[PDB]
């Protein structure tokens with residue numbers, strides 16, 4: 001009962017190169033040419049079955065670890081999160097560790113986040129956008145605000161003195177540049193010559209050492225993310241080692257650094273284009289009554305329109321293209337069976353362009369709704385739904401409201417940028433993100 005297979009021209013590659021040159025065109029072509037939302041491609045040539053029919057999403061996002069296993073596709077993350085941590089730990093321990101982190105990012109921790117985010121955005125604009133007008137790279141400035149604001153929400157004063165946002169961002173960038181995403185499926189790529197020595201193992205040790213000194217200094221005489229993590233207790237009564245705590249801190253910062261940056265950038269590139277003037281007017285009608293000091297209720301409860309803006313930016317250009325699982329027990333999807341040992345995948349990129357669920361999918365329409373229930377999967381669904389999503393939305397909406405209150409923006413090109421599918425987390429093409437800001441005062 002197998003899904004149809006896309007023909008393979010080069011057995012050793014399968015489709016990894018066709019996918020890589022244009023994942024959107026490739027995946028739409030398969031789904032169109034095989035006349036099936038559910039179809040199988042080759043990635044060197046491991047079978048990957050894509051559930052590209054939004055009616056079948058729950059069949060991918062609902063099964064538990066025993067049936068659909070996430071960990072096999074993250075072997076590359078081991079040197080980053082740390083040996084034996086997270087995806088390299090036994091499953092019950094992994095679930096507990098991700099859950100400790102989820103607990104640090106609930107509503108209940110957010111009471112002082114909105115002013116901390118605002119103070120930091122404002123400091124960034126005063127320092128970097130200080131003429132009446134100027135030309136910036138919006139994607140780079142969003143990245144800087146996202147790291148700065150995250151640090152101010154999650155890290156205590158003492159930790160920020162040993163490790164400012166700029167040094168944090170350099171450490172994460174070192175750990176990131178060592179990764180070969182395609183090594184998930186072709187681990188021999190790890191054997192190819194590097195232009196430069198990898199600094200991942202060293203960036204992490206350096207972070208772990210700073211964290212250890214902060215911890216010793218705190219014991220000599222604390223409710224930030226580090227402190228929350230230090231009070232966590234496994235069900236067997238033991239606690240996290242420093243190795244583990246460091247792994248979780250890395251995962252939390254690493255997860256949001258591109259995804260959140262990209263979401264903010266897209267939302268601003270859309271809002272500022274002149275054809276979207278009606279939407280920018282609507283955003284202003286939402287925010288123009290707010291006090292200068294926003295609070296949690298303003299952002300969580302009184303920005304429904306800004307949130308539709310953020311969601312629609314992820315719908316149109318989801319920063320995570322594909323989510324994957326090892327099939328541990330055969331599963332039904334639609335009228336097919338997907339066999340044990342396949343990789344199964346569901347792609348936000350593909351599903352978010354399904355013509356039935358999202359008519360005119362290349363149009364950014366913040367007022368649209370999904371026409372297939374559950375077809376938006378930008379933050380996942382079910383068992384592995386994103387645990388960072390409320391924090392990421394708070395952050396992005398808070399930056400929108402803060403920047404648009406004091407500045408106007410002009411995109412220096414005819415159209416909202418093209419997505420650049422060549423990076424593992426996908427955002428607007430970098431050299432298309434030049435923007436002129438105009439300070440409203442002066």
Ligand SMILES: O=C(N[C@H](Cc1c[nH]c2ccccc12)C(=O)Nc1ccncc1)c1ccc(N2CCN(S(=O)(=O)c3cccs3)CC2)cc1F
Nearest residue numbers: 016019043074077181182184185251254255256259424425
């Ligand atoms: O950015 C990625 N991951 C990173 C690191 C990461 C991994 N797992 C996590 C779990 C929790 C937190 C972080 C991570 C990441 O930040 N992911 C992430 C997940 C959830 N929320 C926010 C961010 C990422 C992005 C793409 C990707 N691939 C792997 C395989 N290929 S490929 O060429 O071999 C291919 C396979 C199938 C079609 S093409 C494509 C890119 C692999 C990746 F790990």
Ligand code: HEM
Nearest residue numbers: 252255256259260320323378379380384385386387388392
């Ligand atoms: C806009 C920002 C984000 C986007 C667009 C996004 C996207 C996603 C997606 C698509 C999934 C599903 C993964 C799957 O089904 O395999 C997911 C899960 C997850 N995300 Fe995010 N994410 C974002 C921000 C964050 C942040 C800030 C964090 C942590 C600080 C985070 C941590 C996680 C974790 C721990 C999981 C679940 C891992 C699992 O159960 O295997 N995300 N996210």
